[PDB]
Design an enzyme around this catalytic site. Sequence first.
Site, PDB file in Angstrom:
ATOM      1  N   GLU A 299      64.763  40.007  24.263  1.00  0.00           N
ATOM      2  CA  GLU A 299      65.402  38.723  23.871  1.00  0.00           C
ATOM      3  C   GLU A 299      64.293  37.707  23.585  1.00  0.00           C
ATOM      4  OE1 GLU A 299      68.358  37.536  26.772  1.00  0.00           O
ATOM      5  OE2 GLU A 299      69.976  37.821  25.310  1.00  0.00           O
ATOM      6  N   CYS A 333      65.540  29.287  24.406  1.00  0.00           N
ATOM      7  CA  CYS A 333      65.791  30.205  23.263  1.00  0.00           C
ATOM      8  C   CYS A 333      67.028  29.728  22.488  1.00  0.00           C
ATOM      9  CB  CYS A 333      65.955  31.646  23.739  1.00  0.00           C
ATOM     10  SG  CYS A 333      66.607  31.797  25.423  1.00  0.00           S
TER      11      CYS A 333
END
Lengths: 547, 543
Positions: A299, A333
């Site tokens: 990720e 993120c």
Amino acid sequence: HMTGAGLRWKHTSSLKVANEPVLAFTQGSPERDALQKALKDLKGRMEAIPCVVGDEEVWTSDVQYQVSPFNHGHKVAKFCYADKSLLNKAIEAALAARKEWDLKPIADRAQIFLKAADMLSGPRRAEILAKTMVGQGKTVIQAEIDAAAELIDFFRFNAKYAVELEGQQPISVPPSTNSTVYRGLEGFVAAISPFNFTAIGGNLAGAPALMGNVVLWKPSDTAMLASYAVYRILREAGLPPNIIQFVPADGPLFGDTVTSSEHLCGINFTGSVPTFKHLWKQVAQNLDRFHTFPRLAGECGGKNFHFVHRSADVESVVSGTLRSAFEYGGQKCSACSRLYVPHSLWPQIKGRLLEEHSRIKVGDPAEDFGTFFSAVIDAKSFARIKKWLEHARSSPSLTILAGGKCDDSVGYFVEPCIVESKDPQEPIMKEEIFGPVLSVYVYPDDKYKETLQLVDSTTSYGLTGAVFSQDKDVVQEATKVLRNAAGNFYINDKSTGSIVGQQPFGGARASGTNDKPGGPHYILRWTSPQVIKETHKPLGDWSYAYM
Amino acid sequence: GLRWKHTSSLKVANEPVLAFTQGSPERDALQKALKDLKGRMEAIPCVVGDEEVWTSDVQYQVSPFNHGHKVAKFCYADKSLLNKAIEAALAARKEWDLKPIADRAQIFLKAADMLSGPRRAEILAKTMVGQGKTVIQAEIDAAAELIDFFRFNAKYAVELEGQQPISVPPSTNSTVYRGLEGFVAAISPFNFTAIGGNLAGAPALMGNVVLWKPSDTAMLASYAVYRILREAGLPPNIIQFVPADGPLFGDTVTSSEHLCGINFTGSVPTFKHLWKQVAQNLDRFHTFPRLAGECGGKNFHFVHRSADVESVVSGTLRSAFEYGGQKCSACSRLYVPHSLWPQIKGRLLEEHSRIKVGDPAEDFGTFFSAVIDAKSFARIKKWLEHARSSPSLTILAGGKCDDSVGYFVEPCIVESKDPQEPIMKEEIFGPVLSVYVYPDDKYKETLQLVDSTTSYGLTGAVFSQDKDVVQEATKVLRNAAGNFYINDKSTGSIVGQQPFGGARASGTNDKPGGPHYILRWTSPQVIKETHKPLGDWSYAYMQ
Ligand SMILES: O=P(O)(O)Oc1c2c(c(OP(=O)(O)O)c3c1[C@H]1C[C@@H]3c3cc4c(cc31)[C@H]1C[C@@H]4c3ccccc31)[C@H]1C[C@@H]2c2cc3c(cc21)[C@H]1C[C@@H]3c2ccccc21
């Protein structure tokens, strides 16, 4: 004939969990008092954090120091980089303990994480919050959703999902009984953690470990105090030794060793795209030496957008965008760094943004709770944002509408920055800053469909994205055109704030493998299942009836 | 409105394996279908959308039992054709992905019903003649497993649409199971036409677009399943039928920036070469390509002295020699105890004589036919020469091989007195069953021997009626077999009952025929919709 009490039955265990409630921390609340005392109990004290391999806590020559981002004078943790000898010892000790840990029933493993989550909820909540705040520079709400809520939910929901999985069993026709056994991967799993979430560190190490894997966990150098706390909670949660190995190390050194080891079966990464891509190339070059095909989960990235339609609740837009872009200094993120505003709504949105920008208080999150967000994490990230801030001054198509100044005298303090881009393809609109810099593009209302395509096509990433409209036909068409532009899509809500079980997190394109942590299917990457077929009748003739 | 949506459940049953006895309507239908290939040779084009493309690189597929009979003429897609097929696929992907799962599944369900009903005889015959399968080995492959692959994946895909996250007011949360952004490359092997149908069919079912390179030596059968899907309602440019040179297909799809998947089944070093090719070209891909590899197979039949001796011989004869032992699941290691070995040797070699090897289309008494092609035959001959030449290897039965009319290998039983001999730990894909003999005293050291012999971990069988040793063997051989069999043969994995796959060097173990396989060909999106204004950006605790 068939047995009434025998293999005719099939029993399935369930677990009815709830999301950990998010505490208010209002004046007079006992969690506020507990957190404030926990904050004062971390002041002059620097915790000595060793490399824990099994139960033997090892110290090495390569001693490193974790500092408070908002006060780089005060060092919060002394730790050390594990060398090749200690990393190879951590691997070999882990494999020796793997087979026993894997054979352990899922309920016995799940209980360790459930009891870890319970003491995380109550008596050790204030500790893990305070350690995240002074360690990573979080405010109380940013640490409460992270170190408390999300980390607790990761341990509870992944436990829930792992016991319902054991119930997913294949069909049995006589004379054969069929059962699926959910083995851990054969070997060790490399878990590499980012600074910005302690919960993610707990998930990347915890979730593989839950499924019967053994884990070499390298935590982030700038999240170390809180990372060792969640490790310590798991060890007195009743996790046996050599199942999670607390092995801090130099990024390259860790990467080189675990990808050169014949017993690597998985990498659970969260961070930047090129370092994940480098590990991907390392395991590919060394693919001949591995026993099993290593399963890489990454990720990364995120150049995330807030798309605004002329029909949008303007007040929700600025509240949502200010939170998404600037909370924890935009070091997420999921963080919004692209605002697409229609021409008609721009003067109202610009005016309201700059007014509310002026009310945003940047300071010490420990001494001043009125602080919205504090310093960014380290000097390297500060330098990177400092060059992005001067790019906003240097570049012709860019104008700084608010903020733009930064000062690293006390801590790595960056003002919340709102940049206007006349160019929708400007590098500031494409490249991830991981700082509090919101880029704004104004589009003509006539060309809102063209802009929707432009949101999709501009960046390499596809993690999070939001569309704001009270018109239901535009969110329908926005949903279909931005279907692959955002793994986590938001209608009239901020692009941050993924709650486990409700918004399983992750995006495709350059943002990673999209294995969806916080959802039911994440754990499936950390099991290599076996199926047992047991026939109870003798087989008969090897030849068939057509001969 | 807001707080309701139509979901759908799909209850499917396994397609029943028909008996094919004399008088049965299925046997007559098959041999009337078989007598329609005898003197015909199908001209199979590359299919890109609805366009039938031919190239100068014309190739032939011959019957393995009669290599003088060209039964399909096809051609290799060049770089120009494959890139044309890629871009055309991408243009069709968005509307296909957006097509609801029920509408996609209905195509594969209809395709399954055709393959089960009026097109069953066709696909069986084309598999037997094309790949050298017998009646029953074609039945469990081209019919049953392919029907089941289409029906059970269709089930699993709509059950998955029901798996939705929790909604807490004032927000409603849904998961949209999108296909992967780009094209998937499906590379099918020769041994199972079903696997070829699944490798391209499953990703497609999940809203992906596929470039499908079928096995050269299974073209006739695999083009026939492609044609089942297309007139079952599969639109153009979702599966591109692109036979090509292995390396050049690998080179082109790993060079394309729009690659998002390789669904591979075949040799282990080729899958690794594709893995290396992807990683070397990782910077130019729009997303991380998902590699699913089904490789390997050096599978074992562990016998304990307390076993049904007649089940051991019957099982191991089937597992090791059916379709000439050309299965990933095929038994190549026989671990027999010293006490029981004189009784098994006597029964192995006895039943070896009754094995009829020959024309499966003409003689239905045939147990198994010729191996697949000249390059497969030369490998087995090298091993049959090695079984003769090696000091530790004694050829108990078989030994000879004749490529006169077809690539015919008689079933070879070898006794190895060394359990670490290459014949114990190297894949044949041919009818070589190699045996080790262990003392009953030294049984649990042999149980740990079978684990650490080979680099593979695909299938494995334990034979014993002592229930205390089968529980012992399940714990020792946990990672030595992905599909473990207690008192049954290593082969014949049924979809929805024994999901097929193994770890170690045998592949990525995604378990095709399992409920989780399809999850490698979906990249989920989660949508959160909040139905009230967000309020202030600052929190209560800050004031
Ligand atoms: O008529 P029932 O007493 O309810 O038992 C049968 C069942 C089933 C039967 O199969 P069907 O759904 O095709 O009718 C059968 C029976 C009865 C009738 C049929 C069947 C078949 C068989 C036997 C009993 C039954 C004996 C002879 C044959 C058999 C094989 C293995 C052990 C025992 C037997 C289903 C449903 C049920 C059943 C039970 C089991 C299984 C499947 C079933 C699985 C799991 C368990 C089992 C035991 C041994 C092997 C496999 C299984």
